[PDB]
């Protein structure tokens, strides 16, 4: 059922019968609301300038635990198994968002020892 | 004059009616004068 | 507005005939609902603000800035009058014993008085004949073909020596060209008619040695179109209709254009900014607004109305021709049985019911409806039980709220009279009205030290209170 | 001055305070002024400092808004809530390559959004709103307001300004298309709205996106309803409407513009053909209250039908089947529409020149059983002169 | 021109000042746009 | 109206020359009292309603409906 809608959308967006330039717009047309970073990452994943209907189907399939573990590992930048609050501040600065050090402390406090274990991260998700 | 409804106002009064209206008007005038005078009394 | 007599008759019959309480209540509810709906419609008219503001400043004849032409409000009743025949002369042709004339435009003649001056007994027309044609022709000589270019109206035998004869058409005839012949019986241009030795008038000059004839008609100008008889006539009519539609669109766009300038001028006037410099003593903005509205808007409205009337006439004629052709085709079909129509069905299907309404959002039409409603309510108030029922319906609040101030001075006086009558002896109603008046007055007086306009906007309430006190 | 926040609060309070009022005086006197002030505020004056003298207005932003969330709490700011400071909004917004770096960034962004949501749910972090607008709002009343065309223009400008981020433009075009239904109600006074839509629909990609929403069916249904209303009116009375045909012509033009997309034509040309044919027939029937705008709409519809009437052999067969079905819809006593119907059909079957392979279309007609309908129509003929 | 108080109108700004004012204006416009969008959200 | 130059000079001197906070407060009180008194007088003027209403309609040259002729107003240069 969904495959039919995807094929119809691919045909519609296919100008000459698709380019990655409107690929994000295709997802927006399908009802999915993507983030610009997510779109850029998907484009990097796929276009190793035009994709095939099977390629778009595969991309949508990845859109419809391992990622959680990878994110947790990324959080432990020092890899000490403990995600440092200072590491969290460095990550947020990399993200460009500005937040209070007290805000980071409160967030970690909301996260016994207050040290985010892998179990703690999983429970957060 | 073709408008029939125009002739609606048909008031009339007896001579006794006029006299009674005069007496009522006099009583009303007296009451009004008394009330107005009360409005100017010394506090 | 044409339904005044209907309103009068309805009021008289309703007041005279005794009726059930439920019937009275239903009638009251219907009337109140009609009045409330009309008031709500008027209160939100798109042009309401502009028209209301303009009303107080310049003496305005009509609301000449409506979108769709209010046909009922647009069709005045011009009366026929005696006008000289020579006045409308456009094309002139003269023959041995007949004269062909074209009018400046179509008109509906009722009777024509023809005087015979400089009469000579040698040749006196024992009779005359008339013919009329409402078909547009270019040249007087072009209509020399007698039968097709004439439709005889009446032949009247004139006694010898009679000068002024008033040939009266049994019904008014609408036409564009006429041919009048001295049916029974050059000196000016020296055009010696070798053909006619002694004609009634010169075949070229119309120099009439027998006599001279002057004519006039108790007529009113009429707008119409020549009858459409051929399919070629149908095509010509379609083309004319399209052209008229285009011209009307241009005129309507032009007329609607004046609106923004009028709005800007109204804004400037509302500022009421004092300025220094009695024919020109008025505010320059006021004079400019008067010139714009009274001068330009009125002229544009008139032109658009004329165009719309012509377009309606053409559409009616085309519909008539098409319906006649369709009916003829149905009659030719033997299988097709002729449908006899009941009188109501015939009237409904007839083209008679086509032009008897104004525009839907016609501010003037709504105002007329409101005025008629006010008159009807004032009448219906006479029955004391009806008065109590209406007060139960709570008309007083609506009357004070909406209809109290708007409308003409006579409308305001009538509304005040009706309001006074409604509280003729109802103590509760009198208390309610007095409470409303006192509340408005006190609310105004609270900001009195700050708003001169507040003091300026209490005249109507005070007049109403004075009138109420006036009726013992 | 420094009273920017307070003055803005007062102004917005006034604007939202009387936005629902419909009286012409109130709209003219209060709503117009507030709208003009807001328009002046939203679009600032052009940059003057030489460094950004030519820089885009959107470029000079010191922050970047959330991609799919609006962090502002309008009710709170109106309530002069302490947490609803402009400085608060500034603090909440983010400031203004290896493939593994990109993947890490995306994962970090997703995890950060999730963590912020969890902190909001469990703790006291506020909840930013989501980009979903209601079908009933001040914009709907304001845009098609019949009080003043200047107010409509100002609202159009404000709305055009409101659509800067593509994510915003998505919901913006959604709401605009949703509001399109009222076009017939205000045939003339809504001209600005159309002007806005056509302006915003200039992007071909946005055009395809709107097409994906299935707007074509809504447009066709609206066109059919308008044609039906017009036919009923022309059949009913003989009144003259100077504005007759504005909505119809506008809708026809919009439909043609949407159809200009070649890929869209390849997509759903067949689905719309029948509506086009029925409309062309009905317009050809319209003879009483015929407007110049109506004539132009009819011409545009005929041109669109002809353009759509050019494709593959299967496409020609589909067009023939559609014609046969429409003729089945035509009444037997009717003797005008079948003329043009069969004329176009014949022109298509054997191409009129300006073994019977050129007549293979006839076999398609037999397949459609149109020959039976042809015999039935032939039976319907009774008067030789009349037909 | 004799009125000295008339000539008092005399503002000045640096290029950096103009740039900062432009940036503040842009930020304010963004905040206004967001607030206005919030005024039409679905309920 | 002849004190226009005097007013401009007084304003320039007051703005340019520094003064004590008490002096500023006194000058402010004086000016405010003058303005308030003038406004109160104008508001309670006898012909105030008539002149005000007439202002918005026709181009008025002068208030030609005063009882005592104001010598300053009635002596043009």
Numbering used by the authors:
A (entry chain F): 8 to 24, 28 to 58, 62 to 77, 83 to 129, 133 to 146
B (entry chain C), E (entry chain D): 289 to 331
C (entry chain A): 3463 to 3647, 3684 to 3775, 3788 to 3982
D (entry chain B): 3983 to 4078, 4087 to 4344, 4469 to 4501
F (entry chain B): 3463 to 3539
Provide text from the study.
Among the >600 human ubiquitin ligases, UBR4 plays a particularly important PQC role, being an essential and conserved E3/E4 ligase found across eukaryotes. Aside from teaming up with various ubiquitin ligases, UBR4 activity is linked to two specific cofactors: calcium-binding protein calmodulin (CALM1) and KCMF1 (13, 16, 17, 20, 21). Our data show that the evolutionarily conserved UBR4 complex forms a megadalton E4 arena, in which inward-facing ZZ-DZB domains of KCMF1 act not as E3 ligases but as substrate receptors. The architecture of the E4 megacomplex is conserved across eukaryotes, but species-specific adaptations allow UBR4 to perform its precisely tuned quality-control function in diverse cellular environments.
Focused cryo-EM classification and refinement yielded density maps that resolved all folded regions of the human UBR4 complex (HsUBR42/KCMF12/CALM12), except the flexible C-terminal extension bearing the catalytic hemi-RING E3 module. The structural motifs that constitute the ring-like scaffold of the E4 complex were well defined by EM density, but the functional domains lining the inner cavity or extending outward into the periphery displayed high flexibility, as reflected by their lower local resolution. A second appendix protrudes from the C-terminal dimerization region, where a zinc finger domain positions another beta-sandwich (BS2) and two associated zinc fingers near the central cavity. Finally, an extension formed by the C-terminal Armadillo repeats projects outwards from the UBR4 arena. This extension houses a ubiquitin-like (UBL) domain and a flexibly tethered hemi-RING module, the catalytic E4 domain, which was unresolved in the EM map.
